């Protein structure tokens, strides 16, 4: 139930943690992995399937290269302690096959390498998404 | 009071829950029951009319072929203990004119075949709903 | 502090309340006083300037043939008590200009023939928009 | 993680707090500085690099000619008793340039000479943002 | 879950929606059926079984003579559309035996002679209600 | 619907805006106006019908030497934009029936001399109170 | 930071999930394990050491015999979806010693004799608490 | 505007950052400053002038050995980015009178040697506070 799922338009910024497509008009503002960024070229069309995200003072925008990737990160957030900036540090390390993968053999000591996840983070996710991936 | 009735555009992605519609570079999520769905091929213009759905953490979209069935759905929403997911899955069993003469008739026996439908969860409905329709 | 402010487009449907206004394959549904309606062809291009009404479980779009107008619904808006359905109803019956000077003039009788409002109700907005207006 | 960035279309009015920018079909009002207003033809194309605030009861846009003024603005409003309203009158008086440096300088009575912002609230900014520009 | 279910002291004045019991120097406002009123004197000491309810701007306390009649107030308070104040109305008019009798047997025209429940109030509680007395 | 409607016991400290009366070792506090003050001793028992006013962020307590008086503060309280500060100014001001009848009367002069009500505040108050006092 | 920790007075009712202690007049509401319930006469003076549990719509308080069990309770709250009502089966099914050295342990089989407790929900106890007891 | 300003009875216990007061049969937790604490004897009567504290998941209550204090504390919390747990580390430093002065000559060093307040910190503190002490 997220809204609005991909956003397709002219580059017109890129910056290290975002970048900002206008689609006719309106300059949308995703932030995505340093990954995803890299293929990116100002002045060109592109289109990023995103995840949004509304709260009662605000609404971020999440950008991937596909809804494969796009999908597990509204996953991360399912988890209790898994913020957004969380999530897309996560995927900055662990791309998504590899993270899937991670999580269904409960390899905690490669989640370990993320920032800003202990024994215990790392351990909540492979507990309530074991299954789930 | 909704704001978005209805959005047009190609169709980028049919899964079996929701579409996908490109209206203008912004790619709308817009979900519907499968009998809508199947009438949907990828690559082709589409047009739903939709109800939409606002909430303190959430924006969710909810599309019919016509806003006769979309304005029932508004409705079944009117009932304490209905959720959209739930509304949803009365519509994939009873088609809007299948329904609103059940809800006329008092027909509990034909809602009782609701998935998450009681003797009582009918109840309300027609109580609620009878003269509404 | 409104956001959008009009919308241009092909007319989808004309119901006795609202206006569905297509703008770029998205669909806007507008209220708006019969009135404002009545001028309205399906088919036909069209713009509104809106007001623009956000709350935690909606966003409503209200419509009308200029800003002038529809900046002095902001207003009524701005009285306590007054709901959006009572000033678009007050508009219904005392057009911009009309309204405008009844309440400068702390006309209470005029305002007392408006659908929902008492003695104090019309001295509530004389009293707190004489000079406003 | 503002989603909204910039807005390009044909003014169709220059107010002196605000401006509308139709971005295909959807007349977005963005407010700015009397100086990037003044900038602005009415029939001409435009673009704004826009900061987009939202809350439970409303969703402001605000404009600047550029994001590097932009993002300052964001910044201002990053200080406990900066409303918009507010950083928008210190970038009145204080262009982006102008006002980055008069922060790193800790120049205190350069600030004061901004509308609302006696001792303290001129120094709570040079201390929260001193480091920060 | 209610954390005041009796207050016991001297009246220290008997209203005709509710009364003060001091409890040890602090005065405690509870209301009540008229009935349970009636038996209370002024000067002397008493005891109500209480009902407390707590929202984000109040908290007020609902006084019987037994906890029987106190708990299936809970109850009605229960069902969508159930105020305070009704369940109140409901029980000055129908005893606490002579009430859980009326929702078991269904008797829909006993309570529409209740103050404010036309047919389909009546009948969404004697639907929720029936197995619950 | 208030709960606390008295408290009874030593006067701890009596200061300008308010008292602490201890009922049974809790020290209370409750405001009331100079006049009420006065007429209390540190180091004796004393009674106030107080009011009590609840929200997500505080709950305080308000105290008169009767509830005739009491219960029209409540009242003020009920006019929309009347604080408790601004109802305990005016009754500082208005003794109780001074003030009821000046309500009644609409005597608008008499409620100016109040610190923070201009014409139309007074206003506000004479026509949704007139009847009601 | 809870605020009542402790309720002494005469036992109003026993109750099987929870118990009405009078302390001065004010019958207070407090919920325990069977156990602790078991040990208490009516009629006798009685002291529970108290968590208190307050949210916008409710203020429950928690009873136990000691508070190195209370702290106990307190801290299963800690965990993510662990509910009261949870917290109070686990105690009523694992003495506070009995559950303290489960959870050292690591003795994932013990926790998952409790109603409600899958595997997962039993080890983000673990996780979150060996530590922690 | 705080409600409970004083608790007095006997300390039921003494931890290290709290205390349990028990007045008439309710057992009350104040917390307070160690120095507080250590005159505190459990067994005997106490009497604690306090600060109380609600929010919509809470209320603390705040204890003192004089109004002074407590007062000075309420102020403290006065402060953007003043939490409750740091202004009762900030008087674990500084006495009440030691800390006043320090606010009043703008003595950061002092607040400096305070767990948890940088220069910025404290400086805010003196900025907001100097003419408040």
Excluded: W
């Excluded at 002219?10 to 689609?23: G, M, R, S």
């Excluded at 996953?75 to 898994?82: C, R």
């Amino acid at each position: 139930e997220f809204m609005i799922a991909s956003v397709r338009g002219e580059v017109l910024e890129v910056a290290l943690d975002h970048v900002v497509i206008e689609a006719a008009g309106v300059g949308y503002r995703v932030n995505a992995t340093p990954a995803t960024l890299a293929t990116l070229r100002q002045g060109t069309e592109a289109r990023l399937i995103t995840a949004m995200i509304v709260r009662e003072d605000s609404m971020t925008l999440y950008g991937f290269p596909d809804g494969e990737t796009r999908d597990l990160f509204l996953t991360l957030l399912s988890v209790s302690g898994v913020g957004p900036r969380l999530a897309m540090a996560a995927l900055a390390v662990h791309d998504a096959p590899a993270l899937r993968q991670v999580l269904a053999d409960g390899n905690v000591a490669a989640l370990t390498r993320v920032p800003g996840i202990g024994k215990r983070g790392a351990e909540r996710m492979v507990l309530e998404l074991r299954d789930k991936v």
